[PDB]
Amino acid sequence: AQLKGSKTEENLKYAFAGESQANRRYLYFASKADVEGQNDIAALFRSTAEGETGHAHGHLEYLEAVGDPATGLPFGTSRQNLQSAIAGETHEYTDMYPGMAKTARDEGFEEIANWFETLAKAERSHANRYTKALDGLVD
């Protein structure tokens, strides 16, 4: 049984995306509870969120055998990880966010379009900072 090409590979990718989003959603919910004064519920969202971190990183460990789910590229060492991050960030600022910005403007969501443009610029900053770190990597 080779993981590359299997249904189990696409399920690990899907579950990794879901666990990742669950951690994000639960911390967002924790902050809503914070403001409401629901400190016990905020603590519970935070603790559950740690569980989803453990789940997501377990999925990622299995996916080391087949590649980074965001890029298809090898990950593992810091050199590989920086390489995969630069490629993903480059996709985000040259393709994904500008194209989402265009569609938002075309559909009449001007503020959301400016938000996608703000994020394209941020991901370009991320990309260039990771590239600088890769240039300085001594491994």
Among 13, 46, 55, 124, binds Fe ion (CB under 5 A): 55
Minimal distance, residue 42 CB to Fe ion, in Å: 16
Residue 7 binds which of a second copy, Fe ion, none (CB < 5-8 A, kind-dependent): a second copy
87 close to 123: Cβ distance less than 8 angstroms: no
The DSSP code for 136 is: T
User: Is 57 part of any known ligand binding site?
Assistant: no
DSSP count for the chain of H helices, then E strands: 5, 0
User: Do the annotations mark residue 10 as ligand-binding?
Assistant: no
**C-alpha to C-alpha distance for 38 and 50, rounded to whole angstroms:** 19
117 is in an annotated binding site: no
Choosing among Fe ion, a second copy, none, which partner's interface includes residue 29 (Cβ < 5 to 8 Å by kind)? Answer: a second copy
3-state secondary structure 58-123: HHHHHHCCCCCCCCCCCCCCHHHHHHHHHHHHHHHHHHHHHHHHHHHHHCCCHHHHHHHHHHHHHH
- Interactions with a second copy, residue window 49-108 (CB under 8 A): 51, 53, 55-58, 60, 62, 68-70, 75-78, 81-82, 84-85, 88, 92, 96-97, 100, 103-104, 107-108
Annotated binding site: 19, 52, 55, 89, 123, 126
Annotated binding site for Mn(2+): 19, 52, 55, 89, 123, 126
Q: Which residues bind Fe ion (CB under 5 A)?
A: 19, 52, 55, 123, 126
